[PDB]
Amino acid sequence: TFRHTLWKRVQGAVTPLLASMISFIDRDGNLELLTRPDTPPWARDLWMFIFSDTMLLNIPLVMNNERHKGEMAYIVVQNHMNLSENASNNVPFSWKIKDYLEELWVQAQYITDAEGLPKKFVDIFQQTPLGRFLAQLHGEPQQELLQCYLKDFILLTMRVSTEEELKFLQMALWSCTRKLKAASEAPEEEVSLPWVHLAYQRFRSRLQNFSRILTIYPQVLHSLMEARWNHELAGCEMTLDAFAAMACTEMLTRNTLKPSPQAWLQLVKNLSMPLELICSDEHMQGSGSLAQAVIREVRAQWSRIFSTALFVEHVLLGTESRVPELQGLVTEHVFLLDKCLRENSDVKTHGPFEAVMRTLC
Amino acid sequence: DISRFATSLVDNSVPLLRAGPSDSNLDGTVTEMAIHAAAVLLCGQNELLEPLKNLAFSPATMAHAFLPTMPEDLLAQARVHWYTCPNGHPCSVGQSICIDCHAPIGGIDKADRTQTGHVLGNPQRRDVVTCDRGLPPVVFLLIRLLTHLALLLGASQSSQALINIIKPPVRDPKGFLQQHILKDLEQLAKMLGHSADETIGVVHLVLRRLLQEQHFDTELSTKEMRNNWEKEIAAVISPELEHLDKTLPTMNNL
Amino acid sequence: EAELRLVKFLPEILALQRDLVKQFQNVQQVEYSSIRGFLSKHSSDGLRQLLHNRITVFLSTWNKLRRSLETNGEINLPKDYCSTDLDLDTEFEILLPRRRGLGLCATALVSYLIRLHNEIVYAVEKLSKENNSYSVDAAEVTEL
């Protein structure tokens, strides 16, 4: 019939268009944030607000009619964030929100100097319809949205494997942005998504070396959980990186030569670089008093374990791989250096200097 | 040839100088290198450096033969998983399908990229030495320099063949060799560490030890025997440069 | 070391690829062959400046290596691509890492850079005798 011909013709101009339009609403599993009762009201509200605007989420008109016969290359819905099955990004339309915030930050950066950025960029975001929409939201939903968004941003811009690591980075960035808001002449009354970016533009190296520490020593679970429980993370400045450094140096000083000698030395040289940065001043510019205190002892233990690393580096391996007669003295002498430098191992002082040389003699 | 070059030199009929030579304080330098190299060519009769005579005096010999010490494809000695699909699209995923046009190849042959002649790029931008096929950069670079000066001599005495053997097309084929030897001696000064004239004397010794050895392939048919000829000439050139700790004070004192 | 010191520019150009692959919603063709014209038609001047810095870095690291890429690559690039010193006024298809055509240049460069890094890391793999398979893929590649 002619009526069915018309029906098919109109089902020949919406199907490609609907397929294209879905690609911007089902990216990283955004759809499952609508058909789930556990989603908070602000989730659906923000989803609808983001979807309703056409300039903020501009979907480019794709013309699927002027191309030569190709292959199986249908509309490709890309997933930036590698999620689990039937998973969803915490904040609705996380990728587009991140891109919009990044481009606003770029505009504010190239239009202002290094000093006007923190306030001009926040105000520019506030002038956005999205900015005033989040200004409408207040109270506990604002905090929940902030936690969800800063949990989403780490997944966007990093690579994480375990959810416990994800929580570690989540509270690390939470404390970082809380500290950055503390030095912003503003009280705890309000907080905005912009700051989550600004912290990442300030302490990027800190979270980077944190990630490298957690990826070079994969068993952060027990040690970091005990460090967090026995020593709470209270404080504006994010100290979880320093606390992880303390735990790492502690249980690596515990198992001096317990694993394979060459393997133990290998792990020491892999982790040498990150704790080398973390004990360096060039990263602890804005650290708090407690952080500046704990880094001193973590650097002392790093120096002691570096000395033990030099002891195990050659005094047995390099040439005593042939002859095993001195392996007993080598095995016991690391413990004697331990018993000589329990507390003060700073080779910069004449006392421990002469102690180390006398022990080696 | 000896007498004819002597006659051309006494009455200023030298093919190199045509009232348009290099005007810096280096035309004389390249001229002394050229005279010394030509003397090594005409005095020597060994087949090891016979390709040098074929390159200089008879440019038609290398109008088709592989000119040595040139960018050569490394895909000749033999794994990084870059396999081109039959339709011409590379793939790297380790019976799969190609990432483009989904060719039924993969898993869930002559690769000749080497060229002939003077494939070297513009000498103006060249600051990296290329150590290849087990040749230390010293002997490799010295062979590079002697090849450049021999080609300059050949182009001066026989233009059209060497104009047709170079792949980069230039309107002054003899013109850019002056800055070629410029950059070559500059990187010699940087790498060796001697003075410019001291490096000139070192090159003099290197090219003289070819003449003082009067005890394989003649036209360098293909790439592998050309590399073999590099191998057998490097072993002869090297010991004199290894004994540069004592010859340097000697040359300084002379 | 002369060409190994250019591995440090690997992440930036990689972002330049990604910030195109995501940004380019397929219009089925390449526009007029001019990067500078592409920046001229680009909307915002801030992203214009960012993309300008990125293309300048990419062209600088490409010109210095195209002669190397002419013979040291593992894919048969036609000799005409690695012949001239490309600039910001060349064809825009270079930036897109297409597996066939002009884009095959850019991809090739990236490949070489990867083969420039892991290979020397391969030497470390021949020294310690214990392999740390910390093999990050070419989307998490950073300054680390």
XYZ file of C-alpha atoms in Angstrom, chain A residues 24 27 60 62 66-67 78 80 99 103 106-107 110 159 204-205 208 211-212 215-216 262 266, chain C residues 21-23 25-29 44-47 49-50 100 128 130 132 134 140 142-144:
46
model
C 25.635 10.771 22.477
C 28.328 6.837 25.771
C 26.811 16.965 14.635
C 25.736 12.957 10.170
C 26.435 10.132 0.168
C 29.015 7.390 0.811
C 33.052 5.017 21.669
C 36.396 6.499 26.831
C 35.192 18.529 28.079
C 37.452 24.220 27.297
C 41.397 26.925 28.406
C 39.496 30.109 27.534
C 44.500 32.154 27.504
C 43.636 4.134 34.572
C 48.990 16.604 39.017
C 52.502 15.309 39.717
C 50.863 10.801 39.206
C 49.547 6.134 40.898
C 53.053 4.984 39.966
C 51.159 0.336 40.254
C 54.764 -0.583 41.110
C 68.080 -9.634 42.848
C 64.920 -4.669 41.439
C 39.558 11.100 16.771
C 37.026 12.048 19.439
C 36.560 15.538 17.990
C 32.619 13.089 14.034
C 32.970 11.567 10.592
C 31.959 13.969 7.813
C 33.056 11.302 5.236
C 35.858 13.430 3.751
C 37.465 29.397 19.565
C 40.816 31.187 19.614
C 41.946 29.432 22.806
C 41.572 25.969 21.321
C 46.177 28.378 20.150
C 46.291 24.942 21.794
C 45.969 4.189 4.405
C 67.878 -7.216 35.000
C 63.259 -9.923 35.679
C 58.086 -5.934 34.822
C 54.171 -2.517 32.915
C 47.336 6.085 28.975
C 52.012 10.102 29.862
C 55.244 11.812 30.915
C 55.989 8.834 33.183
